[PDB]
């Protein structure tokens, strides 16, 4: 996600606050601010569209097979939403590299809570509070 | 071969609050300024009658200085491999972001809580508007000495033939040196000009801030583009636990090979007498 | 010309500190190098001892003509100054030390309760930073000091502190440079290689026993089984008398000590660091080929003595101008515009070379000049002091004729 | 927080400049996929470097199969008419 | 919340352990130990009953519009309960400025786990482990 200042486009600093940084291996090429999930032993790939696939957000652009820094739960992050969102909305990985609300998704529970609302295609600020895996 | 070991600066905002107001270095984050009641008129009375008492009464303007903060964190690998000193650059950014914060707190109090207004209604927006706004303060029996100004207001003012024509101004200084002309700080009985930046006022669009009541600007019907006021009757209150002013900490994370710099200051801004101030409106 | 500086000086900061060319954090970093001890601290202490450890002498030109009744008793300005600053040898070493570690030495003037002069009192240099004008002159001093769990901060005018700078960016530099921060990379390189060596000596400096159990391509041995073997061959219980008896399918291999030249790494670190701090390599307890004798030696000791002389001159002038003259002006009956000089002794004089010189050319020196070179009090009789032939030679004639 | 690989930090990294210069000096074409790894392309943002082969010295160097005059290795952008 | 020693009543220190302390604007007047939720962009107000409204507990008393510090979902806290609670009870906001159990609430999941039991109107010790937002 990116901010415009005159001619210039600046990448946004993804991680606002947070003590929870961990290193994984990229299972595919990934870009800064994408939601991701476990796809193999310590291997991390882009989250699909609904629940059960979220470990954190990727902090920098990687080729496949590179080491990846994640911001986990307990982090506040600047993330793009594919939907208009408001404070107190629970949000979830959208499957498109953005987040969307739980209310829009097929799921019943989110991974991050919106602290600062945003329009569709725009950067919200959110706190990651949970991870989701395979429950069947 | 060696790189261009240079970084071009971004936009830098105008910083004036610390000169353009009474600065209190408070001993406590919370406090009070005592205010005396207005002057009255002595009662006419008969011979031998009791003198009825109508003494001084008092109230306070309270301050609650709020901590403004800014910070950054970088990995030690990034410090070591940087083209320029990243810690120095972040120290400068943190200091600037606090000073900008002070100027937002100041300007939002100044613009929102002025008790008088001169509505130009388009029309005579130059010297006549400043003179009129001094007249609005003068009707409340205070007198101003300073004005704070938006870029669009400045642009209008320096197009005014009263300032732009050297014979009408008495000097060609405005035509030559624009806002740096000495007359721009010596006009309508005001002895200070405080040029503000457009982004300074709290629109509530910036993250972590909830907006003021007005629109700071001078391009559309209802914008407030200047404030004419008594510099002794608007207070900026600064509080710091470890000194007098902005404090920057340089620190390492105890366990993660991360270094950061964090800045803080507590600030409030309060009118002593809001009647001593008038906005100019488009 | 003009009475005010008209070139600008690259120094007026944008922020609300006066630019803080060094911050209080950097000053604590110098203090942390100094208090950490070890080889780095000892080298910088040898630098202080060379520059200032040999003590001082006060001179005034026309000192005899200053003779004045101070308190019924007569004194010269030199006598008054020597009473005003009794322990100047310690103060010069202390301030000179600080002004090598930190950008400046700094302090107060102090008075008795009666308001007579007490001392020039140094202040802890890592606690203070100067604030300076558009022509680069210090206008205020900002002080941050530790307190329980935090800091107290205050501001003092330049009016009543004094400060001294040995190392400068320019002749106009009134703020100075820390030689520690100027060479922080070489200090880091030294310290990191020290740690790397220490860890490598533990892992690789000593041979280690490797017992291999079982036949190659034979039956496998499990952890349970190796525990019993470990009990038999345990080094914690072994000695020089110990012998081992085994079947063919037990092998006692050795990880050798894996040689690396840590001595060469230390010598390289010490060469880099001593040269960076301007000391000769010999100060680091490291020797060198073709550098111990002849003109190759004489040059490096000349370079050292020149560096010492330059620092001493820089310190002497500022101490007289910023400390002694104000004290004479404000607490003394003498003229502060008198020609005071503070000399600091050469640490590397050979008195035998001085004695050789006196034997060879004393016939061209006054007895006063000989007493000065020899570091002795000048003769009591001004006639014998002023004369060129020896006082012992005048005595034998004055008695004998 | 910003890591050395984080997108807002890349212009501050000495290596990001040095390896983009390296890539310009080393390419024969703008077609990155045939010349560089996905790792190199992502880490050094090579799409945004003006890579085209025009700054590779070997674009301009004579490399003749039979060299009678001992003239291989000569660089045309050093001729007097350049 | 208050503690008695002899004649004297003392304020209870809300935070027992944890470092996940975060800053918001108060959307109303708030009191120490009170549960709060996001009422606007970086703005928090007192939680209503039965879930979907909890970000943390307010650490000190504040007026409306003041900046407020909040203990988040890694902190261990001293908090007042509207009913008797026991170790291993899950609890969440009452709407009354206190906490009650998931067992008495119409909700099905809590935000804190009780570590030390307490009677109605007393101070329990609890570990905050989740946040709850708008899921629809
Ligand atoms: K969907
Ligand atoms: K209920
Ligand atoms: Mg009060
Ligand atoms: Mg009566
Ligand atoms: Mg009355
Ligand atoms: Mg009025
Ligand atoms: Mg001009
Ligand atoms: Mg077998
Ligand atoms: Mg803990
Ligand atoms: Mg945190
Ligand atoms: Mg947690």
Q: Which two tokens stand for residue B17?
A: 């609050």
Q: Which residues, other chains included, contact C135 with Cβ-Cβ below 8 Å and sequence gap of 6+?
A: C4, C5, C8, C9
Contact B72 D18 (CB under 8 A): no
CA closest to B254 among chain A residues: A19
Place of tokens 């230390």: C266
Q: A87 touching E, CB under 8 A?
A: yes
Residue D36 and residue A90 in contact, taking contact as beta carbons nearer than 8 Å: no
| Contact present, E41 and A87 (Cβ < 8 Å) | yes
Rounded to whole angstroms, how far apart are CA atoms B5 and E34?
53
Query: The tokens of B256 are what?
Result: 């993660």
Measured CA to CA, the distance from residue C297 to residue C304 in angstroms comes to: 11
| Contacting subunits of B (3+ beta carbon pairs below 8 A) | A, C, D, E
For chain E, the three-class secondary structure string (H helix, E strand, C coil) is CEEEECCEEEECCCEEECCCEEEEEECCCECCCCEEEEEECCEEEECCCCCCCECEEECCCECCCCEEEEECCCCEEEEEECCCECCCCEEEECCCCCEEECCCCCCCCCCEEEEECECCCCEEEEEECCCECECC
- What ligand has the least distance to the C-alpha of B56? 5
DSSP-derived secondary structure letter, B172? S
Resolution (A): 2.7
**Cβ(C368)–Cβ(C386) under 8 Å?**
yes
Give chain C as a 3 state SS string.
CCCCCCCCCCCCCCCCCCCCCCCHHHHHHHHHHHHCCHHHHHHHHHHHHHHHCCCEEEEECCHHHHCEEEECEEECHHHHHHHHCCCHHHHHHHHHHHHHHCCCEEEEEEECCCCCEEEEEECCHHHEEEEECCCCCEEEEEEEEEECCEEEEEEEECCCEEEECCCCCCCCCCCCCCHHHHCHHHHHHHHHHHHHHHHHHHHHCCCEEEEEECCCCCCCCCHHHHHHHHHHCCHHHCCCCCCCCCCCCEEEEEECCCCCCHHHHHHHHHHHHHHHCCCCHHHHCCCCCCCCCCHHHHHHHHHHHHHHHHHHHHHHHHHHHHHHHHHHHHHCCCCCCCCEEEEECCCCCCHHHHHHHHHHHHHHCCHHHHHHHCCCCCCCCHHHHHCCCCHHHHHHHHHHC
Contact A78, A98 (CB under 8 A): no
H/E run at residue A39: strand A35-40
- Residue A54 DSSP SS3: strand
Residues 6+ apart with CB under 8 A from A50: A92, A95, A105, A106, A107
Spatial CA neighbour of B99 closest among C15, A5, C131:
C15
- The DSSP 8-state label assigned to residue A118 in this structure reads B
| Separation between Cα atoms, residue A79 and residue A57, nearest integer Å | 9
Q: Could you tell me how many residues make up chain A?
A: 136
Q: How was this entry determined?
A: cryo-EM
Q: Which residue is associated with the tokens 């921060």?
A: C181
Query: Is A touching D (3+ C-beta pairs, cut-off 8 A)?
Result: yes
Which residues are CB-contacts of C144 (< 8 A; sequence separation ≥ 6)?
B242, B243, C24, C127, C129, C151, C152, C153
Q: Which of B8, B83, B253 to mutate to test the interface with D (most CBs of D within 10 A)?
A: B83
Length of chain E: 136
For D41, name the nearest residue in chain A, comparing CA atoms only.
A63
Specify the DSSP element, H or E, that contains B104: helix B86-112
Rg (CA), chain B: 24
Q: Does E130 touch chain A (CB under 8 A)?
A: yes
Distance between first and last Cα of chain B: 57
**C-alpha pair distances (Å), D69 with each of C315, C333, D63, D64, D76:** 69, 93, 12, 10, 16
Residue E39 dihedral angles phi and psi, to the nearest 5°? -95, -10
Q: B3 and D2: CB-CB below 8 Å? A: no
* Distance of alpha carbon C114 from alpha carbon C331, whole angstroms: 12
Ion ligand 4 neighbours (CB, 5 A) are B 50
Angle in degrees, CA C104, C108, C113, rounded to 5: 165
- Candidates B61, B17, B35; CA nearest to B195 is B17
Q: Among all ligands shown, which has an atom nearest to the Cα of B141?
A: 6
Neighbours of E132 (CB within 10 A): 25
Angle at Cα B192 formed by Cα B188 and Cα B193, nearest 5°? 90
CA nearest neighbour of C8 among C179, C132, C103: C132
Radius of gyration of chain A (CA): 14
Ligand 10 (ion): residues with CB under 5 Å are: E 20
Sign of the dihedral defined by the CA atoms of residues A16, A19, A20, A25, in that order: positive
Give Cα separations from E21 to A75, B264, E133 (angstroms).
12, 17, 18
Radius of gyration of chain C (CA): 32
In angstroms, the CA C50 to CA B148 distance is: 60
Let me know: does A14 contact A71? Beta carbons within 8 Å.
yes
Q: How far apart (Å, rounded) are the C-alpha atoms in residues B260 and B263?
A: 10
* Kind and range of the H or E run holding B165: none
CB of C366 within 8 A of CB of C78?
A: no
Maximal C-alpha separation, chain E:
50
**Residue B92, both tokens:** 């400068």
* E88 conformational bin, left if phi > 0, alpha if psi -120 to 50, beta if neither: left
* CA B214 to centroid of chain Cα atoms: 15
Residues B194, B200: Cα–Cα separation, whole Å: 13
* B234, B275 contact by CB (below 8 A): no
φ/ψ of E102, rounded to 5, equals -55, -30
The answer to whether C217 and C199 have CB atoms below 8 angstroms apart is: no
- Taking the C-alpha atoms of residue D6 and residue A59, their distance in angstroms, rounded to an integer, is 6
Q: What is the DSSP code (8-state) at residue B80?
A: H
Residue numbers of D between 8 and 67 with CB closer than 8 Å to B: 9, 11-15, 17-18, 21
Residue A133 CB burial class (10 angstroms; 0-12, 13-18, ≥19)? exposed
What backbone phi and psi angles, to 5 degrees, belong to A90? -80, 140
Subunit contact B256:A5, Cβ cutoff 8 A: no
* Residue list, CB under 5 A from ion ligand 11: A 74; E 74
Report the helix count and the strand count for chain D, using DSSP H and E.
Answer: 2, 0
The CA distance from C64 to C71, in Å, is 17
- Decide if B242 touches C, using CB distance below 8 A: yes
Q: Enumerate residues 6+ apart whose C-beta is below 8 A from C139.
A: C131, C132, C133, C157, C158
Number of residues that this document lists for chain C? 401
Cβ of D12 and B82 within 8 Å? yes
Contact between residue B103 and residue B200 where contact means Cβ atoms under 8 Å apart: yes
User: Around B190, how many Cα atoms within 13 Å sit in the side-chain half-sphere?
Assistant: 33
Q: How far is B205 from chain A (nearest CA, A)?
A: 11
Q: Is B72 exposed, middle or buried (0-12, 13-18, 19+ CB in 10 A)?
A: buried
Closest Cα in chain B, distance from residue A134 (Å):
30
CA distance C66 to C78: 9
Q: Which ligand is nearest to the CA of E20?
A: 10
Q: In which residue are the tokens 């010349």 written? A: D35
Q: Which long-range contacts (CB under 8 A, 24 or more apart) does B9-14 make?
A: B10/A5, B11/A5, B12/B96, B13/B96, B13/B100, B13/B103, B13/B197, B13/B199, B13/B200, B14/B103, B14/B195, B14/B196, B14/B197, B14/B200
Q: Min CA distance, A129 vs chain E (Å)? A: 7
What DSSP character marks residue B39?
P
Nearest to A125 by CA among A99, A102, A107, A103: A99
């Amino acid at each position: 996600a990116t901010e415009t200042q005159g001619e210039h486009t600046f990448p946004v600093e993804v991680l606002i606050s947070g003590e929870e940084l961990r290193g994984y291996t990229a299972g595919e090429a990934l870009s800064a601010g994408e939601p991701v999930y476990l796809s193999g032993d310590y291997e991390v790939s882009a989250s699909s569209a609904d629940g059960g696939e979220f470990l954190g957000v990727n902090l920098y652009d990687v080729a496949s097979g590179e080491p990846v820094a994640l911001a986990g739960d307990d982090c506040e992050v600047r993330v793009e939403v594919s939907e208009q969102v408001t404070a107190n909305d629970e949000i979830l990985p959208d499957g498109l590299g953005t987040f969307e609300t739980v209310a829009t998704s097929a799921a019943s529970a989110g991974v991050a809570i919106v602290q600062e609302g945003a329009a569709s295609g725009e950067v919200c600020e959110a706190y990651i509070f949970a991870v989701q895996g395979t429950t069947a | 071969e060696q790189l261009l070991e240079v970084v071009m600066e971004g936009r830098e905002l105008r910083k004036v609050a610390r000169e353009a107001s009474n600065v209190i270095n408070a001993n406590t984050r919370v406090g009070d300024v005592p205010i005396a009641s207005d002057e009255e008129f002595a009662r006419p009375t008969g011979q031998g009658a009791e003198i009825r008492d109508d003494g001084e009464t008092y109230t306070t303007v309270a301050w609650n200085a709020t901590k403004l903060t800014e910070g950054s964190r970088v990995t030690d690998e990034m410090r070591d491999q940087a083209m320029v000193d990243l810690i120095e650059r972040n120290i400068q950014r943190v200091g600037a972001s606090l000073e900008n914060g002070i100027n937002r707190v100041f300007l939002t109090e100044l613009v929102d809580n002025a008790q008088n207004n001169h509505d130009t209604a388009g029309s005579n927006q130059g010297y006549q508007a400043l003179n009129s706004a001094v007249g609005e303060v003068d009707k409340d029996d205070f007198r101003p000495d300073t004005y704070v100004t938006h870029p669009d207001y400045r642009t209008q003012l320096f197009n005014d033939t009263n300032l732009a024509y050297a014979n009408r101004a008495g000097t060609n200084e405005v035509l030559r040196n624009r806002e740096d002309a000495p007359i721009v700080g010596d006009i309508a009985g005001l002895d200070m000009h405080a040029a503000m930046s457009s982004a300074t006022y709290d629109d509530g669009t910036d993250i972590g801030w909830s907006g003021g009541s007005e629109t700071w600007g001078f391009s559309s019907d209802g914008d407030k583009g200047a404030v004419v006021y008594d510099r002794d009757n608007i207070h900026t209150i600064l509080y710091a636990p470890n000194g007098q002013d902005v404090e920057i900490k340089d620190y390492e994370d105890p366990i993660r090979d991360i270094t950061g710099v964090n800045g803080r200051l507590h600030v409030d801004c309060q009118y002593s007498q809001g009647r001593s101030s008038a906005t100019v409106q488009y | 010309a003009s009475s005010t500086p008209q070139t600008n000086v690259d120094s007026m900061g944008g922020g609300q500190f006066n630019g803080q060319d060094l911050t209080f954090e950097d000053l604590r970093d110098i203090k942390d190098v100094r208090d950490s001890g070890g080889q780095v601290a000892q080298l910088m202490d040898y630098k202080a001892l060379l520059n200032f450890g040999e003590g001082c002498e006060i001179h005034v030109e026309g000192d005899d003509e200053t003779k004045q009744l101070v308190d019924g008793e007569p004194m010269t300005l030199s006598e008054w100054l020597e009473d005003a600053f009794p322990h100047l040898d310690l103060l010069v070493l202390d301030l000179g030390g600080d002004a090598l570690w930190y950008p400046y030495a700094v302090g107060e003037i102090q008075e008795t309760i009666t308001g007579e002069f007490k001392e020039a009192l140094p202040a802890e240099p890592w606690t203070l930073m100067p604030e300076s004008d558009a022509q680069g002159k210090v206008q205020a001093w900002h002080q941050r000091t530790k307190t329980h769990g935090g800091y107290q901060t205050q501001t003092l005018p330049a009016d009543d502190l004094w400060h001294i700078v040995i190392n400068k960016a320019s002749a106009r530099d009134e703020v100075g440079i820390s030689e520690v921060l100027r060479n922080k990379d070489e200090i880091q390189a030294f310290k990191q290689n020290e740690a790397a060596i220490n860890q490598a000596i533990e892992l690789h400096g000593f041979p280690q026993r490797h017992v291999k159990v079982g036949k190659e391509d034979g039956a496998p041995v499990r952890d349970n089984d190796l525990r019993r073997v470990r009990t038999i061959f345990d080094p914690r219980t072994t000695d020089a008398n110990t012998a081992y008896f085994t079947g063919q399918d037990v092998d006692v291999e050795t990880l050798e000590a894996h040689n690396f030249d840590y001595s060469a790494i230390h010598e390289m670190d010490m060469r880099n660091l001593t040269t960076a701090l301007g000391l000769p390599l010999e100060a680091g307890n490291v020797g060198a080929d073709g550098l111990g004798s002849g003109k190759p030696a004489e040059l490096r000791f000349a370079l050292l003595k020149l560096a010492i002389k330059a620092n001493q001159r820089s310190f002497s002038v500022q101490f007289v101008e910023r400390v002694m003259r104000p004290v004479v002006r404000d607490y003394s009956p003498f003229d502060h515009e008198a020609d005071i000089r503070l000399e600091i002794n050469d640490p590397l004089e050979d008195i035998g070379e001085v004695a050789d010189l006196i034997q060879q050319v004393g016939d061209y020196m006054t007895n006063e000049q000989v007493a000065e070179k020899l570091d002795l009090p000048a003769p009591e009789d001004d006639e014998v002091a002023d004369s060129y032939r020896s006082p012992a030679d005048m005595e034998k004639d004055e008695a004998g004729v | 927080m910003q890591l050395r690989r984080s997108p807002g930090m890349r212009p501050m990294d000495r290596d990001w400049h040095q390896e983009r210069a390296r890539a310009r000096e080393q390419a024969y074409s703008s077609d990155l996929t045939s010349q560089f790894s996905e790792s190199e392309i992502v880490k050094y943002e090579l799409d945004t470097a003006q890579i085209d082969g025009s700054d590779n010295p070997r674009t301009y160097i004579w490399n003749r199969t039979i060299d009678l005059f001992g003239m291989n290795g000569t660089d045309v952008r050093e001729l007097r008419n350049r």
